[PDB]
Amino acid sequence: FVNKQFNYKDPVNGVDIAYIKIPNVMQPVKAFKIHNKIWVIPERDTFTNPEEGDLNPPPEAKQVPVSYYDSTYLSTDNEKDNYLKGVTKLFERIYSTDLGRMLLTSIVRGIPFWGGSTIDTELKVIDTNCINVIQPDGSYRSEELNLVIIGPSADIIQFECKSFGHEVLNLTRNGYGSTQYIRFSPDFTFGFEEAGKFATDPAVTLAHELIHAGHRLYGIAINPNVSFEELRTFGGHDAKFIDSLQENEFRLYYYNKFKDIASTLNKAKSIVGTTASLQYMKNVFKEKYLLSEDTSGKFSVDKLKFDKLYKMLTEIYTEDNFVKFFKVLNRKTYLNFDKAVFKINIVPKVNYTIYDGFNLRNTNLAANFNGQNTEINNMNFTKLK
Ligand SMILES: CC(C)[C@H](NC(=O)[C@H](Cc1ccccc1)NS(=O)(=O)c1cc(Cl)cc(Cl)c1)C(=O)NO
Ligand SMILES: [Zn+2]
């Protein structure tokens, strides 16, 4: 999924390893392009939210076990290189699963829609769904991306999937899509129970955020106002509490949104940019929104292809269905007050590996998830404050 092994020292080439500028909407950061439309910034997130980078503890913080605040984490290149080697490992772990592979494939193909012109006859990029890659002469070159994995802000364990919005457009909830930024650290993990029993496999924590970007990438995210959205996303049993006629009500709201995309494309006459033709980008979305193309060359939304895509995105792609595939132990519900944050290093193949995570085959750890047990495997889990 990441073809070439990256080191943080590896020289910039302005193609994959580059100094880049986030929409603000400031200074350039080293960032790696581990796959089409996926970039990884080994820095703390002091960029996405105007001056939310004091990066130093609040007046009174939640402490154990919800908030962690080290002002120094992800400052050393040695940590940044371990980070990228961290995140690259969880992606391949995720890719090794038939379901993570389909998911990233769903993430990579989910190009944020080109709905950036006030006109309705013209395709135009929404610069918020783009980064600025610095070229040799200091100048910047807009690149389109779907996903950025950047490290956390002040609270190190406050992992989330956020996105830049619009003056009028809800980009995650109108079928269009929006570049997704995932705050994440594979150098820490949350302990749960069912004495302090076990510990979350960071691939599960990562897979959770990729579910979320997926929903937002395809514009079928549920308004934040437990959230319905997190409920769809963790899956399992607690995904029955959802009024099915609030699920019907949405599975129809994002069909009529997908039909309004198909309209916008059919009515498109011009397009903006040097990059790509009106026809290249119409096939691009005709590939995203699995549209259908009659002889005239007018897109329609197939109610059947849309229903499998919506099913795959919303109820096939779930934390719960991920722990099936990962043969791991995970909180069976979203209400298991993780009563610790642990220090970890999943990079070494003796610590943790793509195929079995912490629960190493041919070891004591492969049974009753003894790899995940904070007691048995005390080396790999050091409780913090
Ligand atoms: C880190 C990540 C897993 C994240 N979860 C949180 O923010 C939870 C919120 C929450 C609320 C209710 C139940 C479960 C989770 N924060 S937390 O994971 O730090 C947490 C939750 C609880 Cl209930 C207690 C504690 Cl001490 C910490 C998330 O899902 N991003 O998409
Ligand atoms: Zn969630």
Token look-up 């595939």 returns 325
Is beta strand 270-271 parallel, antiparallel or unpaired with respect to 292-293? unpaired
Q: Using CA atoms, how far apart are residues 299 and 266, in angstroms rounded to an integer? A: 7
Q: How many CB atoms lie within 10 A of CB 292?
A: 14
Q: Which residues contact 342 (CB under 8 A, 6 or more apart)?
A: 188, 189, 190, 191, 199, 374, 381, 382, 383, 384
Domain positions in the chain are 1-385
Distance 319 CA to ligand 1 centre (A): 13
Atom of ligand 1 nearest to the CA of 209: 31
- Using alpha carbons only, give the angle 240, 209, 169 rounded to the nearest 5 degrees: 90
Atom of ligand 1 nearest to the CA of 161: 31
Distance 249 CA to ligand 2 centre (A): 21
Q: Using CA atoms, how far apart are residues 155 and 202, in angstroms rounded to an integer? A: 17
Read out DSSP for 314-377?
IIIS-HHHHHHHTT----SSTT----EEEE----STTT-BTTTBTS-TTSGGGTTTTTT-TTTT
Q: How was this structure determined?
A: X-ray
Is beta strand 122-123 parallel, antiparallel or unpaired with respect to 38-44? unpaired
Atom of ligand 1 nearest to the CA of 212: 31
> Around ion ligand 2, which residues have CB less than 5 A away?
230
- Using alpha carbons only, give the angle 62, 155, 169 rounded to the nearest 5 degrees: 110
Distance 334 CA to ligand 1 centre (A): 8
8-state DSSP, 221: P
Is beta strand 140-144 parallel, antiparallel or unpaired with respect to 147-151? unpaired
Resolution of this entry, Å: 2.9
